[PDB]
Structures are given as C-alpha cells and as structure tokens.
Amino acid sequence: MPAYACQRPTPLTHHNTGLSEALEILAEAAGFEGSEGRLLTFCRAASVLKALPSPVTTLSQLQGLPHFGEHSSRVVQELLEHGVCEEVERVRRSERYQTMKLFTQIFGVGVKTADRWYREGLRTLDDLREQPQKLTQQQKAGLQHHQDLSTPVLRSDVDALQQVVEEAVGQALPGATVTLTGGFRRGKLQGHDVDFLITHPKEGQEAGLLPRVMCRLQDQGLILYHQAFERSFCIFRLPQPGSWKAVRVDLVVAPVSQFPFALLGWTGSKLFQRELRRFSRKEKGLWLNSHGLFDPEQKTFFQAASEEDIFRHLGLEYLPPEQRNA
DNA sequence: CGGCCTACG
DNA sequence: CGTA
DNA sequence: GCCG
Ligand SMILES: Nc1nc2c(ncn2[C@H]2C[C@H](O)[C@@H](COP(=O)(O)OP(=O)(O)OP(=O)(O)O)O2)c(=O)[nH]1
Ligand SMILES: [Ca+2]
Ligand SMILES: [Ca+2]
Ligand SMILES: [Cl-]
Ligand code: NA
Ligand code: NA
C-alpha cells in the first residue's frame, strides 16, 4: 500500500466504513483544535482503510500499513474488540465538538470564528441570532439559510440546475461550457453543494465572464446570496414541489489552457488533491495548483490537454474521478 | 526533528 | 478573516 | 500523528 492517496484507487464505497468514520471524527476534532498535522494523519489513516480490498478483522492486518501508528491502531483495536472507541465517543458527546461542528457548518464561519464564539460562551444558533450586529453579511445569509443548507443536495436535483446555469452562461458568452465537478463527478449521489466549472474553447474569451454570468442569474431571480472575479460562492433558489429550497452552488471560470488543472482540482476529493500537490512537490519537485504545473528549475509550465496528461507528467497511473474518493 | 496544498474573495 |  |  503506497503512502500517498494519489498513488492508489479509492472508491466511493468500500469495506471499512465504520472504522474510517471513527478516524474521521478524530480528524475533525483535531481540526477544531488547530492541529492540522493530527487532522492529516487521521484523515490519511481513514483513507488507507477506504483503499483496502476487504474488511479489517484483526489488528494484525494493520501491520505495515502507512499512517497506522500507536494511536490510530488503538482506535481500530477498540472498535474491533468492543464495537466502540471510548475516545471517539467522548469526542462525539463533548460540548466543544458539538458546538464547533454546529458553528463551522455555517456558511461564512470558519474554525477561527467558531472558536472565538465558543470562548465567548455562545453555544447555539439562537445565541448567534440574538446578537446579529456581531455578524458579517455572509454569516447572516449562512445563518438564515442554515436549515436548508444542512439538507443534502440530491444528484437528481443537479441536472435541472445545470440547465439553468447553462442558459445564463450561453447568453453571457455563446460557446461557453459548463462541467459538473466536485463530489458529484466522483459519483456521489448527494452533496453539501454543487460545483460547476466554466470555460470557452477559444483562449482568452473567458476573460470577464463570471460577472456576466452572475448578473444574468441574479436578473432571473435565482440568487439568494452572492458577492472582476473567477470564483463565486453562491446560495441559489432550487425548485421543490410547490416551493423551493436554498442550495449552495460554486461557480469557477478557467481559460481552456488551464481547464485540465481546474477540472482536476475541483473534482477532488479534498484529501486527494492535498496528497497530489504534496506528491508533486516532495517527490517530483513540481508545483501543482488549479491553474498549472510548474517546474521551478526550468521556470516552465507544463501544457496539459487532459487530466490524463497531468497524471503522466507526475509519473502516476491514471485514476478516474470515481477512484479519487480519498 | 520538519513538514503537513495552494489558491481566490 | 472567509471560501474551494 | 505519523513519515522519512
Ligand atoms: N486543494 C484543495 N482543494 C479543495 C479544498 N476544498 C475543496 N477543494 C476542492 C476539491 C473538492 O472535491 C472540491 C469541491 O469542494 P466541496 O467542499 O464542494 O467538496 P465535495 O464536492 O468533494 O463534497 P460535498 O459537496 O461535500 O459532497 O474542491 C481545499 O482545502 N484544498
Ligand atoms: Ca463546493
Ligand atoms: Ca460539492
Ligand atoms: Cl498538530
Ligand atoms: Na505502523
Ligand atoms: Na463554515
């Protein structure tokens, strides 16, 4: 089993779901305390289990697996022997974990803001609503829409939404295209938000496009919240039987020269892309982001026409999106 | 021990 | 600071 | 928390 997640296929569904979900609780709790290193180790250990071909049934089967040291191994052992890990359950019911999770789920609130509110004594959404001068415009929108935004977006919702975006994009710039990215491109049947990548086949024509798209969506009454730019993090009105619901939608524009890098980055998963960028820099000496792949010794950018090109540049076997669920 | 992804709004 |  |  290789040490980087980008070196192994990771399917969406697998054979160690309960074990991985426990390690991801500990990863999340580490993030809430500001230890990104521990978060990464727990995430990586969880992802190793997702990549295995069958269930872990005995502690012996962790020997030699990367990212399983004394702590992650003890978590798995307790789950194998008792069906529960006391450390995980203590985290689950802790006031700190529950409130930090509640607050960071608000659009416009990160770990740093949630922690400050926690230290001030706040614990509930109604606590926040009773002091709204304390809130940015973004946070106000995230709090007002929190209930709808907490409900998963169904893959069955997405095609009708993509059609609406395509209509606005085609008026803004005929010939421009819309590609579904994010977890839905990896095969998920639900998601917390929808991610779209927009480009045009003629290099340079995409300049200035996103403000034109947003203006047209707003004029159609579809934008509940937004605001030169190339990424937009929106709240959209999605139809429902007899009504509608708020949904988070991300829009990104890339020039066609960069489209394979943007498609790769925005298709994720988040851990897969962090691991891929870490691999590129530490193992290959190349710097990767959603715009390109840079050789800092030649001071040259790799041209890519496809995601396949990028995997080849990096010396990695190609993984389709459905196998990037690290 | 150092390092832990890398951007844009 | 927020966001992907 | 773990790798190298
Ligand atoms: N490099 C990098 N990419 C990120 C980061 N956060 C998100 N992304 C990329 C990869 C994600 O798959 C993609 C979309 O992010 P989302 O939060 O929408 O996640 P995703 O669609 O995978 O899942 P979800 O909507 O929760 O089902 O953006 C980050 O911190 N770093
Ligand atoms: Ca998103
Ligand atoms: Ca998403
Ligand atoms: Cl840490
Ligand atoms: Na080990
Ligand atoms: Na948030």
Task: Tell me how far the alpha carbon of residue A111 lies from the centroid of ligand 6, in angstroms.
Answer: 8
Does ligand 1 come within 6 angstroms of the Cβ of A191?
yes
Q: What does residue A59 show for φ and ψ, rounded to 5 degrees? A: -60, -35
Q: What does residue A263 show for φ and ψ, rounded to 5 degrees? A: -60, -45
Experimental method: X-ray
- Residue A28 Cα to chain centre, angstroms: 14
Q: What does residue A242 show for φ and ψ, rounded to 5 degrees? A: 75, 5
Alpha helices, H only, chain A: 17-32, 36-50, 70-82, 86-93, 95-104, 111-119, 125-129, 137-144, 146-149, 155-172, 182-185, 209-219, 259-267, 270-284, 307-313
Give catalytic residues of A, as residue numbers. 193, 195, 250
Q: Which bases along strand D come within 7 Å of a protein CB atom?
A: 1-4
Listed resolution, Å: 1.5
The closest of A216, A232, A203 to A170, measured between CA atoms, is A216
- What whole-number distance in Å separates Cα of residue A215 and Cα of residue A43? 39
Q: How far is the CA of A54 from the C1' of B8 (A)?
A: 40
The closest of A33, A76, A27, A2 to A270, measured between CA atoms, is A27
Q: Residue A41: which nucleotide is closest by CA–C1'?
A: D1
